[PDB]
Amino acid sequence: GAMGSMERASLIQKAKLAEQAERYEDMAAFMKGAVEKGEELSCEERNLLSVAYKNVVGGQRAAWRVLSSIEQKSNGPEVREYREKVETELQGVCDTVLGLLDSHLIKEAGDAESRVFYLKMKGDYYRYLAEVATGDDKKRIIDSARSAYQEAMDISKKEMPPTNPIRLGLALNFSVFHYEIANSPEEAISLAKTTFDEAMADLHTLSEDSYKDSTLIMQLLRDNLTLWT
Amino acid sequence: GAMGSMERASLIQKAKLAEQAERYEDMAAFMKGAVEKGEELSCEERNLLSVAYKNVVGGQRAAWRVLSSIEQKSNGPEVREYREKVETELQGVCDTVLGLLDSHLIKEAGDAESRVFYLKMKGDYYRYLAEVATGDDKKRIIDSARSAYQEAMDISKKEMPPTNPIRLGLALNFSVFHYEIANSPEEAISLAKTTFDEAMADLHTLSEDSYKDSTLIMQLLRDNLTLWT
Amino acid sequence: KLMFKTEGPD
Amino acid sequence: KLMFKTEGPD
Ligand SMILES: N=C(N)c1cc(-c2ccccc2)c(CC2CCNCC2)s1
Ligand SMILES: N=C(N)c1cc(-c2ccccc2)c(CC2CCNCC2)s1
Ligand SMILES: [Cl-]
Ligand SMILES: [Cl-]
Ligand SMILES: [Mg+2]
Ligand SMILES: [Mg+2]
Secondary structure, three states, X not given: OOOOOOOHHHHHHHHHHHHHOOOHHHHHHHHHHHHOOOOXXXXXXXXXXXXXXXXXXXXHHHHHHHHHHHHHHHOOOHHHHHHHHHHHHHHHHHHHHXXXXXXXXXXXXXXXXXXXXXXXXXXHHHHHHHHXXXXXXXXXXXXXXXXXXXXXXXXXXXXXXXXXXXHHHHHHHHHHHHHHHOOOHHHHHHHHHHHHHHHHOOHXXXXXXXXXXXXXXXXXXXXXXXXXX | OOOOOOOHHHHHHHHHHHHHOOOHHHHHHHHHHXXXXXXXXXXXXXXXXXXXXXXXXXXXHHHHHHHHHHHHHHOOOHHHHHHHXXXXXXXXXXXXXXXXXXXXXXXXXXXXHHHHHHHHHHHHHHHHHHHHOOOOOHHHHHHHHHHHHHHHHHHHHHHOOOOOHHHHHHHHHHHHHHHHHOOOHHHHHHHHHHHHHHHHOOHHHOOHHHHHHXXXXXXXXXXXXXXXX | OXXXXXXXXX | OOXXXXXXOO
């Protein structure tokens, strides 16, 4: 692609610059380019990838919801046309990310910390597709997300401690999937409570710095449980 | 361009949607398309144009300043390359806006409220170029801004009351030009005080609603004077 | 839309 | 950069 001629390390440097400048489309373009060099990513490099695309797709999702709500209220073609335009861009980004995970990040990820991170991302980007799906593939999209999340969960439960931030962020996300996408609110609540309680019981093993990382995500679980119960 | 096949009114509708969605690049693209239909703009249409591009160029300026500061601190090529990339995009947007004003918004604007608005924009977008100019055209860029602003001022003083929000926003902007671009801080202060004091003396003529619009911009003049004196 | 907490930035 | 007040949005 367009980043083919730039050095892997230069792309990573520039992703970090872009992040500081709040230039998240540039950030995502640079990390895409880094990924396409074909080497595995470090922990920090995985984080840069996720943050970039998360920021990009976040703007799209928020814009989609504004438009969709206006469209719902109105029920000429402009509102639907423009909502369709934003939706198609959002779908494009999700497709791009899924593309990177399938070609070939997931298949080369053997470590629990890499594998679970990528499979969570897979579940997330299918979840983003699900939020805007109304067609005959809606069910398959949902099952793709569920399947990605579950494989991640199984690995995380066998291979990581209950306080592992990756495992925690996966469970948070999978619980919201359950609540909101799968229409399984009891499953959502059950997962979020179990996850919180098992984390709680493992905190005693952590350094002050690990303690802060874990409890931050645990508080997110708590926030959702408060809304849900 | 790409908006050639869409109806003028549909472009305006969609600019308004984009604004609500905080999709300012789309907003700007739609208003560019509206402009290129070749009809004059209404007051509301002028505002939509300005707000769109203002939002776009605002993100670029902020990102430029982050990068430029990092670049200044560092004194390999990546920091300068990436600052140059953002700068070139910023220059592109300014050039596009100046293009619209020259082809052919300004020459068809006869009303004080339209003419002054467009000439202020001209001064503003040359001012944005000036903020990032280091070359042998720096002086000409600055003079283009000064010239645009001054023509606007002359018209505003002859044709609008001292409380006219357009006139007020022009004087604010021209005062910052003086302070920061022309390195004329005494001129900046003098313009901002004179402008504030003449507005103050004309408020008695206004409705409650005009009063609120005028005093809001007057407070901006005050804010700068507080920083400057 | 009431949006629930999910991992990472907004 | 200390940015001064100018017309319209940021
Ligand atoms: N550029 C970014 N936004 C991020 C970079 C990294 C990272 C930095 C060094 C090594 C590995 C990862 C992130 C993970 C966090 C998790 C919480 N504690 C420390 C950092 S996020
Ligand atoms: N879409 C936007 N952001 C804007 C639209 C308009 C406008 C709306 C109707 C007629 C003319 C102009 C703006 C000017 C303001 C000035 C202060 N009072 C009222 C509105 S701003
Ligand atoms: Cl559209
Ligand atoms: Cl670059
Ligand atoms: Mg129950
Ligand atoms: Mg003096």
